[PDB]
Amino acid sequence: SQIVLKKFLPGFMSDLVLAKTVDRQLLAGEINSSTGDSVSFKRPHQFSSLRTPTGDISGQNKNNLISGKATGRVGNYITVAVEYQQLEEAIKLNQLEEILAPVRQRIVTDLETELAHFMMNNGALSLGSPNTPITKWSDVAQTASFLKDLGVNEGENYAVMDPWSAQRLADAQTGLHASDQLVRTAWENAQIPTNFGGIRALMSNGLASRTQGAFGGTLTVKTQPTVTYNAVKDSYQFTVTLTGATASVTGFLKAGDQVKFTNTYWLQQQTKQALYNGATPISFTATVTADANSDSGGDVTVTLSGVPIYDTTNPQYNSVSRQVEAGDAVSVVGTASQTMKPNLFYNKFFCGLGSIPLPKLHSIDSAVATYEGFSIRVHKYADGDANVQKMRFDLLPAYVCFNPHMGGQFFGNP
Amino acid sequence: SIDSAVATYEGFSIRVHKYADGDANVQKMRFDLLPAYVCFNPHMGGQFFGNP
């Protein structure tokens, strides 16, 4: 009980696929000391033709010019700090290098967990019923089919699921009839190929989960919202109020829930024609951003991401078949208050990511530790004269959401 | 164990102290100078104004 080995026992480690797939090109070295605490990008333009027997545009009106923005901002600090008695800490832990290994991975794990939270809070598109798991080949191919149907080409598409799903998909692959390579690989290594259904499938164990949030009652819209392109040309967010809800419930709608407008359909953004899902039209859906309560009278005011633009003076920016108006019928997907781990599918140009370098504090010894391309500033100081040393680690990221209409959540369907 | 330097302006020396607080994440600076004065003989100076 006295002699102790100098090698630590192994531990648990998550995996990193989320950071490697998102766009780390557009936003890199842009939040400098001159730009400030935020920076913005531009948006593409859209034009609408006028059809006449002779081309008299006199009095008809002409396409106007409206320019948009997409602001990226910085986040909070990712900080882990420790304190110890150096007499006891230096007993068998030389050079204080034992702390380095399980802190950088903690930092990265927290960063990617909150990044997944951000993406599933801001993503708009939804597929399938949340309860149903992923079981067959179509459940993955539907995401690629939807993304192709919308019209996104310049970029690359991905889909991140959980360990158990892949096994059910590889088990299915073992049932193939003529591909010797696929059957052999699935039988031996239980590894699915790269391109699955036209979209690049990925497997990750560390993925965030969310709670549904209790709701009850046939909801409906009370007041006509403002969804003109002028209002939503900077953020792609609109505020709408609901009625017909439950009497008085806190946490009526959590962050990440999907609200579906039944009678308003998606449009092919270029051809401006409705989307038809084989046997039924595709309905519009938006994602809640922040938690919302319900007060007396069942009046819920909520903020949603993803806008059904139906500007009547700027028809070229339409993205929905009809205008949302009072008396519409809406519903919320899922069950009452279950908790599930979602699956994400997105395009390359959906969310950005970056890091801001931090200068060394004056008259304090420090060092830099790098892990998966992320630099961590570590500081050391000895505040307090009770043999109480202190170390701290810092990291400061930055996020941006380019287009909410190019990603979201998906599940299986029965 | 504090970063410091010496400045010069018109033949005068000013010392620079740069230090920070670890917990609050704030840097601070302070500049110092210490003068000294004597009076050799009061009978060798004064204030002159235009006489009427």
Binding site: - | V6, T8, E10, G11, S13
Partner: protein, 50 residues
């Protein structure tokens, strides 16, 4: 009037009495400039001369 450079270098442990010294400095620069070269090519007593 005379204005002298300030260095605050000497007087470090020394007694100073002569305030009749003015400090002047010579300043050197190296520059890359455009110059036109004329090639006098008189054949007599060598031709190529730039």
């Amino acid at each position: 009037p005379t204005s002298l450079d300030v260095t605050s270098m000497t007087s470090w442990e020394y007694n100073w009495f002569g305030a009749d010294v003015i400090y002047i400095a010579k300043y050197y620069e190296v520059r890359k400039e455009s110059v036109d070269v004329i090639s006098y090519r008189h054949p007599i007593t060598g031709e190529i001369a730039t």
